Design a protein around this ligand. Structure first.
Ligand SMILES: O=c1cc(-c2ccc(F)cc2)oc2ccccc12
Ligand SMILES: [Zn+2]
Lengths: 161, 47
């Protein structure tokens, strides 16, 4: 039931999503090993992801969290980069999309920094890079990120390096 | 998938060394996220 609608570059919604993408790039402590060396992106397309069933699954759960947290979902817009982006947009997020080995346990991980999610597009640690050239810093091959609505509710704060 | 810490719905990873890093977040239920935008892009070689 998923359909993808292209946004026009003229649309304010395209433009605000582009700005969040571009303005949250940072340098990484790996010198670009995982994700490549870059200060900015060439945005080729932005599509709106529409699935009624998946949306209702999200809002149902959001209302539950909200009612457990003084009517505050603590909703954010955050990036996610994954080899499984195509399954995610058709079937939703589930246990198969979790980072089993992540620093905060097996769950599904999101970032404020678009460049952090970019490090996972080709797998954990950047995997072997693009399928075509085996290059984690490929400047040719087309990459995809998700910009996602995420319900945090009451969030456990972990200070960490 | 693990469980949220008892009494919580997510974990926030607050950066504590790299002063330029933003936060990272973990949820333990797939229903707590909706993939709203699909962005297709290239990284650009610095000049
Ligand atoms: O966007 C992310 C995807 C993933 C990710 C991890 C393992 C997978 F198998 C798929 C995606 O990990 C992250 C860790 C920190 C911040 C963001 C991410
Ligand atoms: Zn390539």
């Amino acid at each position: 039931g998923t359909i993808l609608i292209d946004l026009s570059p003229d649309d304010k919604e395209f433009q605000s999503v582009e700005e969040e993408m571009q303005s949250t790039v940072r340098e990484h402590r790996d010198g670009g090993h995982a994700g490549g060396i870059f200060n900015r992106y060439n945005i080729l397309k932005i599509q709106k992801v529409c699935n009624k069933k998946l949306w209702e699954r999200y809002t149902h759960r959001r209302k539950e969290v909200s009612e457990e947290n003084h009517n505050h979902a603590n909703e954010r817009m955050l990036f996610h980069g994954s080899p499984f982006v195509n399954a995610i947009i058709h079937k939703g997020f589930d246990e198969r999309h979790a980072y089993i080995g992540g620093m905060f346990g097996a769950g599904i991980y999101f970032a404020e920094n678009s460049s952090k999610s970019n490090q996972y597009v080709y797998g954990i640690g950047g995997g072997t890079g693009c399928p075509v050239h085996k290059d984690r810093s490929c400047y040719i091959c087309h990459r995809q990120l998700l910009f996602c609505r995420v319900t945090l509710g009451k969030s456990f704060l972990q200070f960490s390096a | 998938m693990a469980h949220s810490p008892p009494g919580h719905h997510s974990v926030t990873g607050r950066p504590s060394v790299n002063g330029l890093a933003l936060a990272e977040y973990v949820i333990y239920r797939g229903e707590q996220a909706y993939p709203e935008y699909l962005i297709t892009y290239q990284i650009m070689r610095p000049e």
